[PDB]
Amino acid sequence: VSLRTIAESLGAAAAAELRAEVERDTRDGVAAIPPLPPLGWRVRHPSGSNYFVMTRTLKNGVQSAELNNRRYRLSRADVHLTVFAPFRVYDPSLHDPTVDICEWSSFDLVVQKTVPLSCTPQDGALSMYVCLASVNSEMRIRSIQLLSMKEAQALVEHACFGNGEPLFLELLRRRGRRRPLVERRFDDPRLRYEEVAQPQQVADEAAVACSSSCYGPYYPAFEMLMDSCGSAGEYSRALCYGGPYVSELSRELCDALLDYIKGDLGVSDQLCEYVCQMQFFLEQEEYMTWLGQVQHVANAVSRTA
Amino acid sequence: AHLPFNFDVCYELGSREFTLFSSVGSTSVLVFCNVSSRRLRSVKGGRSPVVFSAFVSMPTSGLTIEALCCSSLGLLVVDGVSFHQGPLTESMIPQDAHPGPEGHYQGPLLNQRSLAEMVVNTRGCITSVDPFRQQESFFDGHVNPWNARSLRFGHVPVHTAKPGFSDALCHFLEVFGVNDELAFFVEDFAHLVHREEETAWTNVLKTMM
């Protein structure tokens, strides 16, 4: 009887908590609408996950960018941007009061160049992985790595003398398993109804070209290295050559690199603040699902009891 | 001390881990931990506190509740709760160096224990703000919080469960055997494992020289 009462009380509490969570975002009948991403970006979120991935593609090199587009009053290689944003934001001022930064949100960005040349999937598939941090609404680059199939094969063969990385290789031997999660689609309204599988199309094109190219058998190592959601991925990118300390780099080089990242490449401070806002909003959304799940388990326990 | 009601313990020397398990006809609860290498906080109070995970699998519900909880003074505080679609599996359990499910966490920060510890000037887990500095000892939640499952990978949940809801959740989870008796035995066994394993390591080091 005590178990039935406890389970039913928890179920009622979960129902009330979800009711209050929905009531907070009433806005006189219209539930809160998610933050709107910048032009051309489309965000996808695995349900019940702690991350979201937002993709953009420039068919022309950089001339498709908004900054080069405005100009108001050769067919270079097309560019593909994929930003992985997890739910990790914390206040460094709490652990040590000597740092005057209130928020610190990390999110990764991979840029890949494709044919309309060592950047093409056929020739090493050289891409750039840049980590980004939002500190009090300011995007600064943490590290820039130039990752390639050559590095992927070296890590599996000759990080050490002859049989590279007894640690990376064991991670490859285990590699877990993929669990498809239903994908919710928050994409820029303008692109919300044109194409719904563009990110899958580009991911498939890149994966098939890389797999069928040279370094074919080492492609799985490249995929794990590029894994932006796994701990093995971060450790592999750490085994790779972490970019130079940008503060140690030149002042003008850092200035030009910020220019390239913000204006030319298109990932701007507006995008960074949107990433933080969406990290907040989707955590809010997932809390509702957590409340529903706790209600579900409690009600099932009550029914079986 | 003594084991809780209906629990079997598994531990092997050099693993720095132990997992104690109990299956009820419907539900199955498995609680696992890895005692830190660093010095442990003394049970008397006057160093890493011993924190463990508890997987409660309810086949009827079709979900598994993974509860991040730490024992203090033989008691327990459940700092996190999350849900998993499938039943308990060895891949889900972080028994070996591999983690459980990844890219899922949604725990709502049931407890302001981390906030409470910082008014008593307790250093806590994050010793250095720079992550890469601490990332030297990867694959060790004890000395690398940013990849520590038990420390939430350094993320502070946006929500804090309402106290009247959090206490109800704690009472509900206590019905399956995650009570203060379990926490007391877990802490005692953690100290014993720490001591005996350190003794074995010392013996090996002495023997080589």
Binding site: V22, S47, G48, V182, M288, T289, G292, Q293, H296 | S61, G62, L63, F83, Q85
Partner: peptide
């Protein structure tokens, strides 16, 4: 509506 959706995603078996 949200609970029905979550049932569709299968987060509530």
């Amino acid at each position: 509506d949200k609970i029905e959706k979550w049932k569709a995603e299968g987060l509530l078996p």
